């Protein structure tokens, strides 16, 4: 009696689907057309990074809003001072085949991955690896900071894990993915977190009970960006059918898609801003897109980038954005 | 406020000397040559080099520094990963090559070997990447072809109407591996805007000469890299 | 939801003819390639056939070339493989498998144990 579970899954998906249907009063896009939308948004390049070897992979804005981190696939961890652009930090890597770097809120532990399968823990305020949290059967996608003692991973094995930094063991294992997990981006209340796989699908997951709470199946491509809203309730998503999709935790639902018809390239990383009123999305047209949260029209275009933007990072009060490619330099805007 | 230019000229002090520590290791970087091995389990890859210098196993990638006329290279074999391979292929976009590694000796999983070539060849990201061929376990392949039990008719109609090229430089045996070879390049010549081209090279499990096919084939991929950016090619 | 249902199947005589229908669901079909796959008792998956989004490009591979046929209907959301000339060991359960990339040709993932953007797969049974 296979199918006949099969066919329960499916009645229970048609449920769920329809439910979400009945509460679908009506679209965001067509409710913001009484507020006057954002115009025409242009920033310039205040600094230049460089000095990184090979393409950038990575970056994490600090809770200071000052230093920030980049991660090359060279075996490179470089920490820069957006303000003085001088380095304060190189790490050279164990392994060259770094794909994501994280950075404690407290300032004085920073995180690193890749195809290595081993996140490794680097203390600033001493530089070495602190620990090397193994036991992953896949590429580290993607790191952040819960706490000074806590932190999440993503891997490529379809699970994602909280591990406890001292002890170096799994506190917390996540197994419901299908797809390989490509990124997470963690709530300001710290208790819940979304996690987009290479699926169509996106979960959200609890540090406490370590399960799913709830799942999020709009887009049709691999979910390569994540992030959640300034306020915890909403988060969009980037899969590489160019399409940008935001839901809402508590909806359950898409609200708005932001698309254009002459954007057909894939899209790397997504982050709001301070208000949460603008979406910075890096394509790999060699640039970024200022999408309007509310209104879903691009806003403005950042395409001082040779190459694909690999990452994208927002500064807690939203000062300046930092972006970084390919071309082994990052970009600051603002 | 001498404090504050002081603690901004210990940290230019600082960013003088992270400078150095990059200008140092840009030599190194420079001087090595990044190479992607790829190939199923069937293959010979993780013994594809005889001229290796040192051979060391991390926890998942299989790294083999080798020196061939005082120019180096650093081949990474990524074995310890998932089925699911076409988002960390990403990450080798900028190698000097890459060497998929083919057992020319089975013919019902040459179809899978065929299959993950075209997906490697026509990927976005990998159009300005080659990939270098290396036919692994020749004496396989014709102990099998001589042997007559097993008939590749049965899973490659084409070879009954097929024959050995006119430029073939070595008869069964023969035959069969220039048809796998040209099976395999019309696959690499069904795509490429002449920045990239295919190295077929047969080789076997017991010949020394892969590291200067390697070399060889490396040094005419970045010449005619190069050629094309001076519009010469 | 990305989704697909294929129909048809059971059991069919060898030498025959059958047809086996799939329709996709939460996306645009018109945009993605699209390839058949093939999982045998005790053995992995076989790739047998591709198909391009406007059919520009069709292939085979060496073992079903000329014998199957493959087209697909966009106006639809439909793929369509009809099956001829079926032998007792080409029987397996046949799956679809999307690109995983809109109007790309690099198709990486299609025949992984594990992949997403496919189907659930119908018994092909093919016995005298």
């Known amino acids: 009696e296979l199918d006949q579970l099969r066919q329960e899954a499916e009645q229970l998906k048609n449920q769920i689907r329809d439910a979400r249907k009945a509460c679908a009063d009506a679209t965001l896009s067509q409710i913001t057309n009484n507020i006057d939308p954002v115009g025409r948004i242009q920033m310039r390049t205040r600094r230049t990074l460089r000095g990184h070897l090979a393409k950038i992979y990575a970056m994490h804005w600090g809770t200071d809003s000052r230093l920030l981190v980049s991660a090359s696939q060279d075996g490179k961890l470089i920490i820069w001072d957006s303000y003085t652009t001088n380095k304060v930090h190189a790490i050279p890597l164990r392994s060259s085949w770094v794909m994501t770097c994280a950075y404690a809120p407290s300032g004085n532990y920073v995180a690193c991955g890749g195809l290595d399968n081993i996140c490794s823990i680097y203390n600033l305020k001493t530089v070495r690896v602190s620990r090397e949290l193994a036991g992953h059967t896949g590429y580290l996608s993607c790191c952040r900071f819960l706490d000074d003692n806590q932190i999440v991973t993503s891997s490529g094995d379809t699970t994602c894990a909280l591990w406890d930094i001292e002890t170096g063991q799994q506190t917390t294992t996540f197994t419901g993915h299908t797809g390989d997990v490509m990124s997470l981006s963690l709530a300001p209340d710290t208790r819940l977190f979304v996690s987009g796989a290479c699926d169509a699908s996106a979960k959200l997951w609890d540090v406490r009970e370590g399960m799913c709470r709830q799942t999020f199946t709009g887009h049709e491509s691999d979910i390569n960006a994540i992030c959640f809203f300034p306020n915890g309730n909403a988060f969009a998503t980037g899969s590489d059918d160019a399409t940008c999709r935001l839901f809402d935790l508590r909806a359950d639902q898409e609200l708005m898609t932001y698309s254009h018809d002459n954007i057909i390239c894939g899209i790397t990383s997504v982050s709001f801003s301070k208000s949460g009123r603008l979406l910075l999305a890096g394509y790999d047209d060699f640039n970024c897109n200022v999408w309007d949260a509310l209104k879903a029209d691009r806003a403005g275009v950042l395409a001082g980038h040779d190459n694909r933007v690999s990452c994208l990072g927002v500064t807690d009060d939203g000062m300046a954005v930092a972006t970084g490619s390919w071309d082994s330099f990052l970009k600051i805007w603002n | 406020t001498e404090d504050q230019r002081n603690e901004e000229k210990a940290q230019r002090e600082a960013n003088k000397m992270i400078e150095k520590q990059l200008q140092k290791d840009k030599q190194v970087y420079r001087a090595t040559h990044r190479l992607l091995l790829l190939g199923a389990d069937n293959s010979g890859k993780s013994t594809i080099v005889k001229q290796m210098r040192i051979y060391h196993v991390n926890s998942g990638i299989f790294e083999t520094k080798f020196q061939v006329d005082k120019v180096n290279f650093h081949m990474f074999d990524v074995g310890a990963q998932r089925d699911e391979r076409r988002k960390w292929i990403q990450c080798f976009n900028d190698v000097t090559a890459i060497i998929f590694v083919v057992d020319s000796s089975d013919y019902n999983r040459l179809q899978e070997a065929l299959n993950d070539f075209k997906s490697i060849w026509n990927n976005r990201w990998l159009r300005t990447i080659s990939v270098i061929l290396f036919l692994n376990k020749q004496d396989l392949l014709a102990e099998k072809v001589l042997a007559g039990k097993s008939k590749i008719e049965d899973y490659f109609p084409e070879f009954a109407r097929y024959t050995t090229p006119e430029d073939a430089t070595p008869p069964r045996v023969t035959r069969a591996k220039y048809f796998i070879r040209d099976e395999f390049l019309r696959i690499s010549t069904a795509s490429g805007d002449g920045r990239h081209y295919c190295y077929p090279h047969f080789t076997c499990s017991v010949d020394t000469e892969n590291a200067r096919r390697i070399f060889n084939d490396c040094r005419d991929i970045i010449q005619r890299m190069h050629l094309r950016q001076y519009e010469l090619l | 939801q990305v989704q697909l249902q294929e129909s048809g199947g059971g059991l069919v005589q060898p030498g025959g003819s059958l047809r086996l229908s799939c329709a996709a669901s939460?996306?645009?079909?018109?945009?993605?390639?699209m390839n058949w796959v093939r999982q045998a008792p005790g053995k992995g998956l076989e790739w047998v056939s591709d198909?391009?989004?406007?059919?520009?490009?069709?292939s085979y591979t060496g073992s079903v070339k000329g014998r199957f046929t493959i087209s697909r209907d966009n106006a639809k959301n439909t793929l369509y493989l009809q099956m001829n000339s079926l032998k007792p060991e080409d029987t397996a359960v046949y799956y679809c498998?999307?690109?995983?990339?809109?109007?790309?040709?690099?198709?990486?993932?299609?025949?992984?144990?594990?992949?997403?953007?496919r189907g659930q797969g119908t018994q092909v049974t093919v016995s005298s």
């Open positions: 939460g996306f645009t079909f018109s945009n993605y390639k």
């Open positions: 198909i391009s989004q406007s059919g520009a490009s069709i």
């Open positions: 498998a999307r690109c995983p990339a809109p109007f790309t040709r690099d198709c990486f993932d299609v025949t992984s144990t594990t992949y997403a953007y």
